[PDB]
């Protein structure tokens, strides 16, 4: 019985920490979701310069390349 009271009280502070933790995590995921939208643009441009480098390399190798 007294042990149970102690356990219930510790469980109460536990549950409060649980809810606070998860609320912060909700904010975390929400933040990342909003961020995500501001990343696809950059990703596209990254792949654009990537394939640019790839294709220009292939063509330079085709012509008189001037590498090492």
């Amino acid at each position: 019985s007294p042990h149970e009271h102690q356990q219930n009280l510790l469980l109460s502070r536990i549950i409060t920490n649980v809810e606070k933790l998860n609320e912060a995590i909700m904010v975390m995921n929400k933040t990342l979701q909003e961020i995500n939208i501001q990343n696809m643009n950059i990703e596209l441009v990254a792949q654009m310069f990537k394939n640019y480098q790839s294709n220009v390399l292939f063509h330079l190798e085709a012509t008189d390349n001037l590498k090492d």
């Binding site: 356990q7 912060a24 975390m28 933040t31 643009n41």
Partner: protein, 66 residues
Amino acid sequence: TLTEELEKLEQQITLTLQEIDSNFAKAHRIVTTSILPLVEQYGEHSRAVWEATKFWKQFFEASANV
């Protein structure tokens, strides 16, 4: 011996519960510590990168639009 082990393990259980609470709250503190400002900084610099890409993207759009 019987009631002895009963009370002993009962105290162990209570102690272990408090320990679990401690570890749990430690994880809570870690997240609430600076992870949120850290990702805010990340997104801020990312926003700056989008401003970087804001220029060159126009030319790709121009290429699509002749």
